[PDB]
Amino acid sequence: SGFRKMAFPSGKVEGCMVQVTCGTTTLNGLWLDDVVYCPRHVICTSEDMLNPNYEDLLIRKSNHNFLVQAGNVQLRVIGHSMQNCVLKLKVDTANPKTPKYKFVRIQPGQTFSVLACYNGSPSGVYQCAMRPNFTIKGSFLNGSCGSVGFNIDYDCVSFCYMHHMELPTGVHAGTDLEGNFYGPFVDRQTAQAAGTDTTITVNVLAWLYAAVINGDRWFLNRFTTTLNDFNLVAMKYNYEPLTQDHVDILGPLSAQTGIAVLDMCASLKELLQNGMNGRTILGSALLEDEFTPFDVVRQCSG
Amino acid sequence: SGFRKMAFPSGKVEGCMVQVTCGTTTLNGLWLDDVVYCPRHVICTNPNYEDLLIRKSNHNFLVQAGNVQLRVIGHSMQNCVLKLKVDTANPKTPKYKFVRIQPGQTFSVLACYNGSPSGVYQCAMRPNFTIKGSFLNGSCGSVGFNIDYDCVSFCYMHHMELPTGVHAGTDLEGNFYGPFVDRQTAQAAGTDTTITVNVLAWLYAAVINGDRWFLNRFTTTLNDFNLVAMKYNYEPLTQDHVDILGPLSAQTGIAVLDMCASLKELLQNGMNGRTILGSALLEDEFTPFDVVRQCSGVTF
Numbered sequence: 001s002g003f004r005k006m007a008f009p010s011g012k013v014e015g016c017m018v019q020v021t022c023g024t025t026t027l028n029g030l031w032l033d034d035v036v037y038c039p040r041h042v043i044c045t046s047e048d049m050l051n052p053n054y055e056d057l058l059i060r061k062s063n064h065n066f067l068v069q070a071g072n073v074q075l076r077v078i079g080h081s082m083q084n085c086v087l088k089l090k091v092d093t094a095n096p097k098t099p100k101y102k103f104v105r106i107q108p109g110q111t112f113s114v115l116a117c118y119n120g121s122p123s124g125v126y127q128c129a130m131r132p133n134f135t136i137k138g139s140f141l142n143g144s145c146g147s148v149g150f151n152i153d154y155d156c157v158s159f160c161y162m163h164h165m166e167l168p169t170g171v172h173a174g175t176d177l178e179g180n181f182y183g184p185f186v187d188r189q190t191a192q193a194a195g196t197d198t199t200i201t202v203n204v205l206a207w208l209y210a211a212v213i214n215g216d217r218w219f220l221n222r223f224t225t226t227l228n229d230f231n232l233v234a235m236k237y238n239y240e241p242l243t244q245d246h247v248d249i250l251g252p253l254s255a256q257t258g259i260a261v262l263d264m265c266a267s268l269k270e271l272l273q274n275g276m277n278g279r280t281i282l283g284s285a286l287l288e289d290e291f292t293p294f295d296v297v298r299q300c301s302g
Numbered sequence: 303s304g305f306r307k308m309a310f311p312s313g314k315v316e317g318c319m320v321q322v323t324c325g326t327t328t329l330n331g332l333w334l335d336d337v338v339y340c341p342r343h344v345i346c347t348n349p350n351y352e353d354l355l356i357r358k359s360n361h362n363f364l365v366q367a368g369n370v371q372l373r374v375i376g377h378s379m380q381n382c383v384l385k386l387k388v389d390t391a392n393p394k395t396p397k398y399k400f401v402r403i404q405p406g407q408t409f410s411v412l413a414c415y416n417g418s419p420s421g422v423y424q425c426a427m428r429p430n431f432t433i434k435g436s437f438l439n440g441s442c443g444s445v446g447f448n449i450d451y452d453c454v455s456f457c458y459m460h461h462m463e464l465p466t467g468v469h470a471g472t473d474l475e476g477n478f479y480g481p482f483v484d485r486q487t488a489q490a491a492g493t494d495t496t497i498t499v500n501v502l503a504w505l506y507a508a509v510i511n512g513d514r515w516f517l518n519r520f521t522t523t524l525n526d527f528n529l530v531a532m533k534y535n536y537e538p539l540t541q542d543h544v545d546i547l548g549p550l551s552a553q554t555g556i557a558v559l560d561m562c563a564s565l566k567e568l569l570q571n572g573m574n575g576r577t578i579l580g581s582a583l584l585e586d587e588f589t590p591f592d593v594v595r596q597c598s599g600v601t602f
């Protein structure tokens with residue numbers, strides 16, 4: 001029993017974290033095979049950041065301007081290239097600790113683990129979700145750039161996030177490992193701000209199914225709803241639309257618990273109307289939206 | 303910015319987890335140098351473990367480190383932990399120590415299944431000596447640890463789930479945390495209490511992160527506040543707690559008894575539909591050190 005925000009074991013990623021230094025700037029890089037991936041803004045000065053011309057800055061760099069350090073070992077850079085907003089530094093040594101891995105771009109609502117890192121040394125691991133507004137509510141201090149987000153399935157590490165910046169509301173923005181930002185953000189000091197966030201409805205429903213699995217039914221009711229009536233109400237609480245894909249995805253949890261998806265939608269509607277009246281669900285006094293349907297089946301059943 | 307329930311990087315521990323099978327029981331062990339540590343209740347069959355173990359032969363214990371088999375060459379018990387001597391020392395053994403933690407202190411848990419780590423989370427030793435973990439069948443032998451520089455301090459090994467869903471275990475010397483035994487008897491968690499010094503730490507974390515609405519002009523005294531704590535089933539606040547929070551008090555300008563007044567008012571009046579660091583409840587599983595470490599970055 002129990003239900004925690006559980007991260008993946010981080011060892012496979014730990015063995016890939018290095019320090020990258022350009023000029024006065026040091027941040028983290030991800031060392032896979034003979035390539036080190038890091039945010040391209042490592043080549044910028046703070047001045048450059050209003051309107052940086054990355055192509056112009058990079059053509060001026062020599063391989064030996066990049067200092068890469070893996071533990072106590074300096075790696076020799078032998079080439080470099082830029083892919084979208086990520087710098088790829090080719091190094092003379094392949095990482096002998098390279099796990100089986102892939103690069104995956106995730107959708108809003110997906111979860112992943114973050115290995116927060118400073119000066120190429122991992123500090124801690126925690127679970128995160130990609131918010132509907134393409135930010136993440138992480139925990140990152142100065143020097144955390146280049147920290148990565150990942151899932152691990154059957155010993156394959158799927159890298160899905162690389163950290164670039166903190167937005168003014170204290171939430172975080174970054175790219176996939178092909179260097180494409182999530183959301184409308186840019187690696188430029190601009191007046192960019194997180195869009196208004198919403199609640200990840202399909203994840204809330206999955207968590208409610210998790211509550212029933214672990215033995216709590218107090219929030220259920222005898223009503224049902226149409227999908228469209230549910231969305232009409234949910235939008236009034238800044239909940240994300242629930243799609244037929246979402247209904248299909250919850251099929252297994254519906255089947256396991258005996259509670260039809262649209263009946264669980266009726267319960268959520270009432271919870272939004274009533275609050276919890278001093279009660280908790282899986283230890284929380286708020287509705288949790290950073291557990292996915294996949295996560296629930298992974299942690300609750302096996 | 304931000305504040306998350308954060309665990310230590312688990313890599314150094316992952317390389318020590320093994321699967322231990324005896325009879326019909328399979329569970330997780332911890333392989334350090336040439337010993338595998340696991341719960342003694344892996345022993346076959348009111349138990350008398352010193353008797354049951356006499357019956358077992360080394361070869362009754364199948365130990366799998368991934369795909370490799372470690373051969374057992376010896377066994378002994380230390381309290382509720384079984385120690386299997388194996389023929390191969392773990393080449394991935396980290397620098398480590400066995401430590402016993404105090405209620406209120408936190409640690410990371412690497413939850414495992416068939417000697418395969420599957421998740422890591424951060425927990426506190428509750429005042430009632432249980433932990434609010436997430437464990438399913440097969441988790442027994444999963445371990446808790448902290449990392450200080452390069453040194454792993456192992457502090458917990460999971461032995462059982464209790465009827466309220468919380469969990470009980472031992473230190474790595476096999477001494478239970480709390481009034482529990484490893485046998486099928488009637489056992490229950492005692493009434494728990496809230497860890498006051500940790501709630502205060504988390505309020506400081508909130509302030510550091512810009513959440514200041516609960517602050518007020520008032521201050522108080524230990525004696526006065528401790529009467530409120532007892533009323534609300536909060537642990538007593540000691541002078542040593544006050545000293546430990548010293549740093550955060552200096553960094554935010556909010557003295558502990560200044561912050562206690564904020565907490566008193568939250569306990570008496572509630573949060574009035576507001577939240578702190580994204581919670582509608584007062585959180586008590588972050589220590590002062592956890593807050594300082596995460597709001598001022600240390601790395602391992």
Ligand SMILES: Cc1cncc(C(=O)N2C[C@H]3CC[C@@H](C2)N3[C@H](c2cccc(F)c2)c2cn(CCc3ccsc3)nn2)c1
Nearest residue numbers: 025044045046140141142143144164165166187188189303
């Ligand atoms: C609280 C916190 C959370 N998470 C990360 C940090 C953190 O550390 N950074 C993120 C921000 C803020 C400082 C610096 C690094 N970023 C600036 C920036 C501005 C606009 C877009 C963008 F993508 C980056 C920047 C980059 N550069 C080039 C030299 C350099 C690159 C890395 S450090 C210095 N100059 N300003 C902080």
